C-alpha cells in the first residue's frame, strides 16, 4: 500500500521533472513533507495495474484523455478545489477532467494546433482557408507551396473539419451524449469537402505526413504548416524565422482543434490525498510552481489564468490558448476510441478518391453511434 506523510509523483519522461521535483523541494522546506519525482517507462499503463491492487504514486501526471479510463476504474479521488480556486483556473480546463459529473484531476497544461508561418515567405498569414489556394498559386511561381501538413492523422485535419459544424460527441453542461456524433453532419461535410477539394487541385498531396510536413516547412519550402507546441523546439530557427497565429477560418467559422489538457489526478488509495491537493493548488498552480516547470520544459499554455497572462507575452503561447479556447476538449469517453480509427479511415480514404466525402463520414458516423 502506499506510504502515509509523504507525496510520490509520476509524471512522463518528455516533462519538465526536474523543475516539478523543484516545486517538490520547496514543499519539503515549508512542510516537512518529502516529495519524490518520478518517470517511469509506460508509466501511463503501469498506472492502472498497481493503482487497481491499492499501490502507485500519490499523484499521476498524464494527458487528460486517459484520465477517463482511470477515473471508470475507480483510481482517481474525487477532487476538492473550491470555488476561489476553481475559478483560477480557464473553465474549459475543467471539463476536460470532469467524468461522469465529478472533478477528477487538477488542469496544469493546455495543447492545441495553431498555424505556423514562415515571416520570410508570408508576412501576413491568411485570416481563412478559403484564401490558401489563390496564395498556393502565388507561391509555387517561385518553387513554394503555401501549407504542408500531416492529412494522415485525423488529429491534425479535425481542426477545418470541426469549423463549420463537426464534433465528435455533443458536451451539455458537464456531461457528454454518446449518441448525438457530429461526424456526419454538413458542417463536417463542408469541411472535408474543402480539404478533399484542396488535394484535387493539386494544392496539396494526400500522402503529406508529419515528417514530411516538418522537413518542408524547416527547409524553407513551404510558407505554412499546422503543429503543436512540441514541434517548436525543431523548427529550424537558422532557416526560418517563423510565427504562430490562429488557425483559419472556414466559411467564417473559427478552426476548432481538439484540446489536450495535462492533469494531475489523486490516486483513489493514496492515504495522502489532503497533502496532494495542497501540494497541487498551493505549490504547483501557482505562479511559481508553473514557472519551475514551464523554465525547465515548456508546457506550451497553462490553465492557471495568472500565469498564462504573463506566459501569453510570447505570442506562440498566446495563439496556443487562442486555438484551444476556439476548439473541442478531447473525449475522455471509451467511445472517443471509435471516433479516431473511424474518422481516420474516412479522412484517408475521402482524400484518396476511395470513398466519396459524403459515403466516407456516413460510414465513420455509422461506426461510432454503434
Known amino acids: 500500500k502506499i506510504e502515509e506523510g509523504k507525496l510520490v509523483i509520476w509524471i512522463n519522461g518528455d516533462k519538465g521533472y526536474n523543475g516539478l521535483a523543484e516545486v517538490g523541494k520547496k514543499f519539503e522546506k515549508d512542510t516537512g513533507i518529502k516529495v519524490t519525482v518520478e518517470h517511469p517507462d509506460k508509466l501511463e499503463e503501469k498506472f492502472p495495474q498497481v493503482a487497481a491492487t491499492g499501490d502507485g504514486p500519490d499523484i499521476i501526471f498524464w494527458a487528460h484523455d486517459r484520465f477517463g479510463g482511470y477515473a471508470q476504474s475507480g483510481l482517481l479521488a474525487e477532487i476538492t478545489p473550491d470555488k476561489a480556486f476553481q475559478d483560477k483556473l480557464y473553465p474549459f480546463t475543467w471539463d476536460a ?20 508561418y514562415n ?23 517561385k518553387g513554394k507551396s503555401a501549407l504542408m501538413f500531416n492529412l494522415q492523422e485525423p488529429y491534425f485535419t479535425w481542426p477545418l473539419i470541426a469549423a463549420d459544424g463537426g464534433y465528435a460527441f455533443k458536451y451539455e453542461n458537464g456531461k457528454y451524449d454518446i449518441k448525438d456524433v457530429g461526424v456526419d453532419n454538413a458542417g463536417a461535410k ?33 510558407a505554412m504548416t499546422i503543429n503543436g507546441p512540441w514541434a517548436w523546439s525543431n523548427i529550424d530557427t537558422s532557416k526560418v524565422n517563423y510565427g504562430v497565429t490562429v488557425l483559419p477560418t472556414f466559411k467564417g ?27 497541487l493548488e498551493n505549490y504547483l498552480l501557482t505562479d511559481e510552481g508553473l514557472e519551475a516547470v514551464n523554465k525547465d520544459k515548456p508546457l506550451g499554455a497553462v490553465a492557471l489564468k495568472s500565469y498564462e497572462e504573463e506566459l ?59
Open 190 to 222: 463542408a469541411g472535408l469537402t474543402f480539404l478533399v477539394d484542396l488535394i484535387k487541385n493539386k494544392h496539396m498531396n494526400a500522402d503529406t505526413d508529419y515528417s514530411i510536413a516538418e522537413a518542408a516547412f524547416n527547409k524553407g519550402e513551404t
Open 97 to 116: 477532467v470532469r467524468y461522469n459529473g465529478k472533478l477528477i484531476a487538477y488542469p496544469i497544461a493546455v495543447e492545441a494546433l495553431s498555424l505556423i
Open 119 to 141: 515571416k520570410d515567405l508570408l508576412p501576413n498569414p491568411p485570416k481563412t482557408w478559403e484564401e490558401i489556394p489563390a496564395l498556393d498559386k502565388e507561391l509555387k511561381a
Open 312 to 370: 501569453a507575452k510570447d505570442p506562440r503561447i498566446a495563439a496556443t490558448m487562442e486555438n484551444a479556447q476556439k476548439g473541442e476538449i478531447m473525449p475522455n469517453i471509451p467511445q472517443m476510441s471509435a471516433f479516431w480509427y473511424a474518422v481516420r479511415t474516412a479522412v484517408i480514404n475521402a482524400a484518396s478518391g476511395r470513398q466519396t466525402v459524403d459515403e466516407a463520414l456516413k460510414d465513420a458516423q455509422t461506426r461510432i453511434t454503434k
Open 253 to 279: 467559422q473559427p478552426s476548432k482543434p481538439f484540446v489536450g489538457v495535462l492533469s494531475a489526478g489523486i490516486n483513489a488509495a493514496s492515504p495522502n490525498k489532503e497533502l496532494a491537493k495542497e501540494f
